[PDB]
């Protein structure tokens, strides 16, 4: 059994609250686990509209990174869009990270812009139901959509089989967030070497009701993981639903790279 | 003879350094038995974006639920539920609302009178309970040059104190959302104290359990000995964070007060 | 010749640099000096629309008092707007203030609401003829008006005798501000045991193109101040077309008030 | 025989920690003379909104001039005046934009070449002038994981070895608005040579003093070995900014330099 340090990192709109239930389950098998707010999420006092980039946003997980103590190495788990945190920050920490874990997240790849399943995610799943809309203009000039997750999309779509408990937490902490998908596509694509280079285990159900079957499955074909494992049921939120499984799943990343 | 079931529009009320979060059980609970619910984040609490150096006394704090009750509907009554610091959040809204208050339900919370000074319960907390453990202080002048000490709770305080008997799914959600915090002590030493007409007309029921760790039998005794409430529910057993550890129980409990008040 | 620690206060827009000619004068008769930049003026980081009141905008000067060590006492220029930083500052920190300078600025008082004075100026000066104003919704939903300062109002009415050299610095470091004028209307008057009980002395020129003789006239006969020093010619920004002079003045403040 | 006088366009590029402030005489002067003028501040310079840990290249570094360069009219050509550092802000813009550039004004500046790698004339000045003195250095990783050296100017080298001869109105100035700055020497150490066609086919012009206090006479000199400029003007006296210390004569070179280039 090895014992792991697990860095997990929220998608946009939500924070370190996510993982209240997978931190203690993996806890309870004797691995070491960071939960971090990502900039203007969580209970991070900076507001969205002073983010300009996802690598700015990214920058909680990039200062850790920066921390971490020579020869120490973790295994970041990102859900949703923090597959996007992971290949930034694998691009500038691939000695520090033993391998990057995506849950029901977007998987980047190397070949094309980072943007680029961000555009897939967006075909698959165009309409965001209840979600709100709202503009500012970064400090360089460029138009920043935000979006404040609708309360429906939150019930049936992210949250479909979670606790009400789960789902009323939900609503009590969520803060907006964005893409910054018009500058992941003026982004350099993520490099061979870094994140290109990383151990990339990939965590997902058939039950997930946005990040839907479909664009799963392009994306396994699109850029194929090391390592796939498919929990059955539950729904996006697989860290509240199937909690112990995905703790079992990431008992065997950290058994297989330390 | 005749009995009656009343549903009734509950505002939950954190208490420093929480957010509208720890009612994330009570909320759906309630409103399973057909009542409505808010659940507010004070300033600088939850997920609220200011931050507490900008906040400058307990009513400043206050301003959510104070704006919430100045909406209500004409004719609209609420019941509002403090947590352990929140009694004084109902106290300053009945000093402003009192007509928009059916009762104010005070759950292991402050229970401040008209007689005393604002800070009176807060001082007996203090000597009650004067170790905070791991918690660490800091301080920041504020809009008139009073210096305010904040606080950052500690994780050991948080586990053995407050969340006692909580789940570790409770106690790593509290860890990852909780926010700095402060008692206004000696702003609301201050203040004037509160009214009769206001807060002292109040309906007020007084829901405890003895196993709370931090809001302690013997303070918890001298508050109801010292004010005394409508009503009086001793929960058996949990901890300081009811609406978590005794959630079904605190709920049937608030269907009790709404009969009679709402 | 009472030698004391002057702190110099830029007003909205401006930042350390107006004071980099009074700096050193004020130097050369061996005092000790402090120009601060205000939240998001002169070289500072923050954004404007990350600021959301006249107090918040305040912060380092307020952070640099609260670190003033034990007994040591400031004199606080504030030029044009800067008044009301002064105001702000002396009902937190009374003590550390041996006395007030108010340079061609407005003169808050403790009987008006906080905005009073910016609403008789913006009377006495209402065309600010190129400036651009913008607007943002501050984070407690307050609608916020930024003005970017046109630069024929910098050459006729800031800088009008200034040296071409100092009106193109000008120019080159200028950045948004606001007079958060709608919050100051909301703020708690300044407090007579604060702002109230301070020594306050007032410059100005009547050749001040912006702030004009009767505002400034208006200004003091509204609430008198200890001293009235006034300087022939120039034009608004004394500390740049009347250095000595403004030296020679605040060195009779550090002998009366030190 | 037949005289001519030239009006030209200038854009006057700041050394790394400055802004476009330190043109602040230069730029009236020059307009005395009916020359248009643009200074710009680089990414994470004078009152640019960037940090400096957020930009990763020196060419990163460089966007505003890119930027402008690119707006330039169809048939627009101007004159680079670059100081210090800013001999490298010119070899990339002109490897970008060749024909919209009538020559590059090195300036106490840098003299990349060709034949060596971007980083060749960064090693020198260091192996030049080894000793920063109280001037203070950061790190931070950048984009594809690169270290990045920034440094905090020390307020000492500023005095007497940048602004040695300068009023203190303008070393209070500089102290007032300087920022961090970074050589990205590192990552130029990994960058394409600057190409021929480019760069090596702008006229460059070499204005230096033997006065300057930290690029000094024998790197200077060596530069103007390695890589021979079309022209070189000396100035006797001043220091290391000579468009505070020497504006006039800096202008009535720069209109020598439109009369022959523009």
Same mark, same amino acid.
């Given at each position: 059994m090895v014992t792991a340090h697990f860095v997990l990192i929220h998608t946009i709109?939500?924070?370190?609250?996510?993982w209240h239930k997978l931190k203690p389950a993996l806890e309870r098998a004797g691995h070491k686990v960071t939960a971090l707010d990502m900039?203007?999420?969580?209970?991070?006092?900076?507001?969205?509209?002073?983010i300009n980039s996802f690598d700015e946003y990214s920058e909680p997980l990039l200062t850790f990174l920066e921390k971490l103590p020579q020869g120490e190495k973790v295994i970041i788990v990102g859900e949703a869009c923090a597959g996007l945190n992971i290949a930034i920050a694998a691009d500038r920490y691939v000695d520090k990270i033993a391998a990057g874990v995506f849950h029901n997240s977007l998987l980047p +790849?190397?070949?094309?812009?980072?943007s680029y399943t961000v555009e897939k995610l967006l075909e698959s799943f165009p309409d965001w139901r209840d979600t709100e809309y709202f503009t500012f203009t970064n400090i360089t000039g460029e138009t920043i959509t935000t979006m404040k997750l609708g309360f429906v999309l939150l019930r049936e779509?992210?949250?479909?089989?979670?606790?009400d408990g789960e789902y009323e937490l939900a609503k009590m902490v969520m803060r907006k967030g964005s893409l910054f998908q018009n500058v992941l596509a003026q982004r350099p694509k993520f490099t061979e070497k870094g994140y290109g280079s990383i151990k990339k285990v990939y965590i997902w159900t058939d039950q997930d009701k946005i990040f839907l079957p479909d664009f799963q499955r392009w994306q396994i074909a699109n850029y194929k993981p090391d390592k796939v494992y498919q929990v059955q049921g539950? +729904?996006?939120?697989l860290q509240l639903t199937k909690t112990e499984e995905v703790a079992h799943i990431l008992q065997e990343v950290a058994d297989a790279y330390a």
């Open positions: 709109c939500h924070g370190a609250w996510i900039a203007a999420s969580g209970i991070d006092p900076r507001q969205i509209e002073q +790849d190397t070949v094309h812009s980072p779509n992210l949250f479909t089989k979670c606790t539950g +729904d996006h939120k």
